[PDB]
Amino acid sequence: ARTVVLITGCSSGIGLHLAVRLASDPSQSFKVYATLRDLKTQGRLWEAARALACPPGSLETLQLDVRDSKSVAAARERVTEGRVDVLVCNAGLGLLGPLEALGEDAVASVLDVNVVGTVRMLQAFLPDMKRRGSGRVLVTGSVGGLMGLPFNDVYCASKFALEGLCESLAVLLLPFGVHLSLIECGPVHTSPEEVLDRTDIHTFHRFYQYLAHSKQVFREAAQNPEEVAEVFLTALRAPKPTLRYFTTERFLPLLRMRLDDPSGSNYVTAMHREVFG
Amino acid sequence: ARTVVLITGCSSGIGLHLAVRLASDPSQSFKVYATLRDLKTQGRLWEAARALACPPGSLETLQLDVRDSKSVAAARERVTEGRVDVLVCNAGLGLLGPLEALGEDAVASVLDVNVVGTVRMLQAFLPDMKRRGSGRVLVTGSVGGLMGLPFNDVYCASKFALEGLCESLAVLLLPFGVHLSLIECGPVHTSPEEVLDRTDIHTFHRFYQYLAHSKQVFREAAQNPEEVAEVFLTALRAPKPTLRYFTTERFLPLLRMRLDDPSGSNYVTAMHREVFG
């Protein structure tokens, strides 16, 4: 029997690279259900799949919108094996800008996709894993889920939310045989005018500085998606997986500083200087 | 000029005690706008206010539903002074139970009130604080926002979400003169049949154990609301407030263990043993 894997958010980035890495594995051990919110975006996945020569039947695409529990249930029903060995909750949205410049709908959407959509996947797929006493859940996390980043208030809110969701579930799942793990990613290679109308000139200037700083960190530290995707595989094959895997060690010093001063003052000062010099 | 304070969620608990502590201050330095989602619940606030003899005009109630940006805007307009010196984002919901037993609407509501509602308060009130270069924002946090608790997956999700929201905003607000702080609270003195239908017998049994453990921690460690409310006041009067204040030192050892093993394995094991013995 092959390992059945269901991944959300496979139109690009991590989810696309992980789906074709697993489907193309030389051992042919995995059957992958790559899900996408809109099947019109599946072309890059099929072009990457052909390039790694995934065997016929190793990869299938399903439409799955994690904002809708009916779409979640109908994709679950399309899993012909009647079981999901590995569930990868990767679907996600970013949101960048002055908090007061973000639309209310955009805010609600980031939380609904990143947080409620993961809850909807877990409600639909966990019960069967708990009953069989086996199953692996991998959740794409971010450094933004471990420490707060300026102008990413809502995005960070949603990634910190996943840390608390997963850690709470991990405490309960320990003796059930169901393993949950977050894969903590740094940056990965994957109008000024409207913002200026919704904020003050100083905040706008600080946003510019954040953006110039961010592009520089990205240019210097973004990892290839193949390297990040391999951390998922490592977590998948660990006999007793930990709650968190880190794709890089680059942000651990910032992490440790944050974690060693619970008042948060050292972190706030250090991150303001790191971003705004 | 009096310090104008606007507090959300004042029908009971922390928000009710803080509103009457501030309005009854012997110095008469504060004017409090105590807001409630449903004004039919304001009786306990007025009974507590009379008992502490808050002077006439020291305390006013406004209806404010943080799920609705129109209700947020109309309460802002009722602030006759045209300024809010201290904003207290305290409105919040709990959610307890097996993740698969929680209704989709209940999940969405906890996030919308606890997380999006705080975002809506900050969008409505921050810009004026940034323009004046002064203002204090206090957010009620929880130990459940710092570490994951079994059967509180969504509640923890929402409190961790506030940590990432506030920390992200704090990094930007540092030089603006606007101070944001989380007040980290432990427990504070403030049908089996439907759950059994939505989960397995083992999860149900574990829920019972969590509940018996929780009631015991509460009975032994719940703090009086007057003590918790005073930590808000302390943060309010600090000339250079920190990002986080802790109402107690009881959970710091668990916190430190969690923070010293980034893999999360020590935390998961220690919390499973603490709750389930």
Ligand SMILES: C[C@]12CCC(=O)C=C1CC[C@@H]1[C@@H]2CC[C@]2(C)C(=O)CC[C@@H]12
């Ligand atoms: C937001 C971001 C860039 C875009 C991206 O794709 C992934 C990340 C995560 C790491 C962020 C970084 C931007 C700059 C940050 C604030 C730092 O100085 C340290 C943490 C780092």
Ligand SMILES: C[C@]12CCC(=O)C=C1CC[C@@H]1[C@@H]2CC[C@]2(C)C(=O)CC[C@@H]12
């Ligand atoms: C959920 C809870 C009880 C009800 C309440 O009102 C506030 C809290 C926060 C502290 C929780 C506690 C329940 C039991 C927990 C899991 C522990 O063993 C350590 C942390 C503690």
